[PDB]
Structure formats: C-alpha cells, structure tokens
Amino acid sequence: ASGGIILIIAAALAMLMANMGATSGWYHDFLETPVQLRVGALEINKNMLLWINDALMAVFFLLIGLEVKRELMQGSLASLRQAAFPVIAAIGGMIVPALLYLAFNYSDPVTREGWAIPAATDIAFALGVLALLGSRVPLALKIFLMALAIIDDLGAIVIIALFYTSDLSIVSLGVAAFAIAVLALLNLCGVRRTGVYILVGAVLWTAVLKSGVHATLAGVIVGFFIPLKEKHGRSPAKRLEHVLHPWVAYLILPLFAFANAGVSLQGVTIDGLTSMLPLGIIAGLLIGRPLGISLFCWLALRFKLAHLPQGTTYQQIMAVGILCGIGFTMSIFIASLAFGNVDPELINWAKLGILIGSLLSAVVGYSWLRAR
C-alpha cells in the first residue's frame, strides 16, 4: 500500500500549491507555460501541462499494455469464461455512470462530452485502499479489481481516440502505420531486445504528438508488441513490467497527481458543487459506478452467463464497485481530454467533482470491507 499513500501526498501538496498565496500563481503560470517546438515548417504548440501529461500517460499506459497482454493470455482474461465476470461488470460500470452523468448534463452540449469521466477508476488508489486493510483480503478481488478497471480505463481511451478525437495529419498516420508495421515485423521475426521496441515506439509516440490521446495509445500498442515468451527462463514483457512498476507508482503517477490535482478552492460553495457538471461526476462515481457494477454482476449471476472467483460472497463485489468510484488520476486525465480547448473552468469544476466523488467512494468502500 506504499504506492497509494505516496500518491495522496502528491495530490495533497498539489492542493496546497494551488491554494496558498505564495505558491498559487507560480503553480498556475508554470503549468500554462507555452512550449513551442519548431522543426523547419513543422510547429507543435502545446502548454507545459500538455507535454507533461502526454509523456506521463504514455509510460503509464505502456505498463498497462504489458499488464493487459499477460492478463489476456495468462491471467483472468485468458479464457472467454473467466473473463465474463470482469467484462460484464465493466459494461455496467460505464453505461450506468454515463447515463447518470448524461441525466444531469443532457441539456448542455458542452458538458455532455465528458460522459466518460465517472467511468474510470484509479488503479493505484483502489489497490492502495485494498492493500491498506488487506491483511486477508481475497486475492481474487485484486485480480478482479485490477481487471475491472483496466478495461474501463483502456476502453475509454480507445473510444475517445476513435470518435471524439480530431483527425491527425496524413503524414502522421503514415509514419504511425509504418511504426506499427516495424513493431509487427519485429515481433514476427522474434527479436527480444526491449529497447528496439521502445526505439520504434518513440517514433510512434512522436508522430502522434499533436494528439494527447493517440500518444497515450502508443504506450498500449508498444506494450502489446513486447514478446511474452519464456525462452531460457526470461521474458521481455514480464521483465519490462517489473522495471516500470516502481517507476510508475513512485514517480509517474505522483508527478501526474501533483500537476493535475491542484485546483483553487476559493469561492467554492455547496450550491456550486451541486451544479450539473460536478454533481454529475459525483453521482456517477459514488452512485453510478457501484450500481452498474453490482447490477451487471448480479444480472450475470441470475442469467447463467456468470463466473465466480474464489471466496466471492457477492457482497464483497458491490463493495469493490464502491471502491471503483475512485476515479482520481484516471478521471482527471479523461476530463483533461474531454474538456480540452474549451472554457478553462470546465476542467477545474470537473476536478472538484472527481476528488469529492473519489474521497467519498474511498471512505464508504473502506467502511464496508473493514466490517467484513
């Protein structure tokens, strides 16, 4: 549970940075510093926070690409029957939070673009709460919770990068196609040097640098092409996952939380928090997330399509759904993509609803499994 506490400290300092008179100002002007890269006729204009998030989430989703790959062949998602229960819980833990969010924001076309905000879950935070009181928590829950949030987080990035995304340059997709083609020929030829995949992945990440969501998917694509074979007792993807895990939990995610979880609390009132944008996220995370997860897990159990992990009780499942309401870093990153290049207060109001929703989802989920 070490990675969970060090993530809150980074968010707590970010709040102190954005609310103290001496720190706020330099904290806001730094994150909005223009960074213009000019290469001949080419020109990439992104602010400081954009360059930071495009690089941090690329490494974070590279670890996910390795984790998804070994879960899809060796873990819970390996077979179509074992993967039924986590996937069914994911579709429910998305359509119900979205409908609740859209129930509040259907009248405003600007805000209903972020319907995928209360559909994410901070994996490092949710695992941290479990590991906090996890002396004898059923190991199948951590496999279920990790697999449940992995599909909702990756699915949200794929959906955003397919429809609500802006089409990139034709030259960008051509290099991206060639970069994936090289990664494909590399895996088919049987090369196992992890750095060569990262070298080609850097070309893939650079070609789609203008789109933050495509540069994020570059990490997922590279993580899928890292070989997992166990030749001579060595695996590149298992070894790369072992190296990235401490760097992501102790540097990547803390830096992302310190640079995004900092909003000013001056002027925030109860009536302001009950408006459609923040309350829609609060209701989507605190209520919509456990409801859809509990409903779809239960519907699967009754209609014969379900599988059950070891020591299920199916009362711990809904408490996990409450713990899935901890969007935090993932929901903030989803909100940064949905509420980009629009009114600068949309992203601030979203972060207020995410943190209140995540803190309440953490305490309520803490109060149940503690009793169990």
Add this chain to the structure above:
Amino acid sequence: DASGGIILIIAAALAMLMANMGATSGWYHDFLETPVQLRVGALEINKNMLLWINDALMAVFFLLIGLEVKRELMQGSLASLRQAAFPVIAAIGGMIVPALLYLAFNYSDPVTREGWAIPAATDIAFALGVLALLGSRVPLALKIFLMALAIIDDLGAIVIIALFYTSDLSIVSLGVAAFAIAVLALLNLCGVRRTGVYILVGAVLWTAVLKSGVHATLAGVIVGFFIPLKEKHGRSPAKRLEHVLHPWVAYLILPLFAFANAGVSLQGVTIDGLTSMLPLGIIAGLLIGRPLGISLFCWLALRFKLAHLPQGTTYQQIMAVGILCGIGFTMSIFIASLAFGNVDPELINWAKLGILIGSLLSAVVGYSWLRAR
C-alpha cells in the same frame, strides 16, 4: 568481432553517397541544416538539426566512455598510482606533436588556429575494429593500450575545449548543473543502486547545459563517473549498464553520428584544394603527427625507465598502433564540429576531408604494416 568497425564504415559510405548524387544531395543537405527552435515561455534554444543530433548521440557515446574510464581508472588498466603511466606519457605526446604540426601549417591564419586539437583524437570504434580484422592472435594488452590511449586524448580534448574554447552559459544554467552534480554526489554517498535514478538526474544536467554542445557532451562522462561500481551482492550497476550500452553505441549511436556527419559533397574537390593549410594540416597531424608523436614519446619514456612496455608488446608493435591511432574519423569530426562552430560553414567541410583522407591513410598503413610483424 570487427562488426562494429564495418558498420561504422558502411554508415560513412552511405553518408558520402547521400551528399554526392544529385537525387539525395538536396535532401541530405537541407535536412541537416533544418532549424530546430524550442521556445519554453521566455526561454529559447535555436540549433540546427545536426546539432540536436550530435548533442544527443555524443552524450550517449561519452556516457559509455565515463563508465569505461571509471572502470579503467579504479580497477582496470589505467588504474591509479602510476600503474599504467605508459599511455599517460604517450597521450601527452599524441597531442603535443599533432597540435604543433597542425599549427605549423595554420599559424598564419588565426581562424584555423582554433582547430589545433582536430588531429589529436582517435576513433576507438574504427581503430579497434581494424585491429580485430587481424585479431586472430594479436596481444590482448595491445588492444587495451589503444583503448586507454585513445580515451585520454578524446576526453582530454573535450575538457580543454570546455574550459577555454567554449561559449559562456547563463548563470542559471550553471546553478542547475551544479545542483545536478550535488544530488549525483549525494546519491553516490547514500549507496543508491538504481541506474535509472542517476540518468533521470543526468537528464536534468544535460538539459541545463543544452545551449553548449561541449558541456552537454561533458555532462555524459560525469554521469558515468557517479554510477556505482562496487561489486556488492554480485551486482555492479556500472558493469551491467556498460554491457547494455555497448551494443547500442557500436551499432546505432556511432553509425548515426557517422551518417549525419561524414557526408561531404566532393564536387569541385581538387588536389590543390586538399593540400591547403587546413586539410593538409590534418593529414600530417594524423598520418604523421600521431605516429611520430606517440613513438617519440614512448621512446623518451622507455629509455628513461619512466614506464614499462606491456607484456606481449614490442616497441615496433607499439608504433603500429601509432599509425593506427591516426583514425580520427567520428571523434575528430566531432572535435572539428565544436572548434569550427559559428564560423564560415566551409571550414567544417574542408576539415572533414582532411580527416577522412588522413584516417584512411592511417587505417591502410596501420593494417599493412602491422600484419608483417
């Protein structure tokens, strides 16, 4: 084997083909001169494409050097307490004679006097690669002597350039750089074994001195000096890092540096042009200044019993490395790129001609004259 020395030649041959045939001479020239402007708020760095490439490739190349130096200066060949003072006294000779010989040609031209360190370097990849082309039963300490001799001239040239012939960096750059050295020293005293943490700090050090290509390169050896080398628990962060860094430097960094620098348009090159004070001064400094400078200073060190000729070596075999130490190539091109920066753009072009001709004449003579002995 000698695979690294051949790839370094293919990359240089490809670079020469790009800059001579009309189908690619336009793109190869316009690409390397493309301006790359990075503007971070009020800050701004303006360098062409080749500078950004060289400041990144040579930073990785010298990171591997700093690892080999610390190994060879504490538990290796060079070591300390005058264990291997034979390459030390030779390295001083391998720099004084090539410099004074080069200055004898360019003393009348103050512009070309700055490049007195061009024929005072040695391409370790090509010099050891041609030594492996006959490396069936060559003495192991001979290839050690070359690797240690070339490092002192290569690292010593960068230090002299970064102390007197360098551009002034901002006081803010030196502050962040010195603060990066402080944490590097603190991470070393605290026994931090993570290789990535030293490089993450080195990324701050490299970006702080990014406006000066010499200091950005000099920042690579410093990171290699602070990587822990202690063999506790069977682990050695400097050894394993070098084992991973070595195949990348030999097959990617040096070939790309050669492909991006060895490309010179030979159109209009005449015999009278190659015999000018600038190119011929590099020819004599490499083909003559390096062998005569090394052999003469080994002579003075041997008869005066200052140093000892290593086991498995001969003095006639020693000078076979001297004629083989005239392999400037990528290292001398990098030295020439720093000394002839922000001046007439044709100075670096004539310098490269005097480097490749002097090195090719050094490789053929070194190969043909050592195979007899």
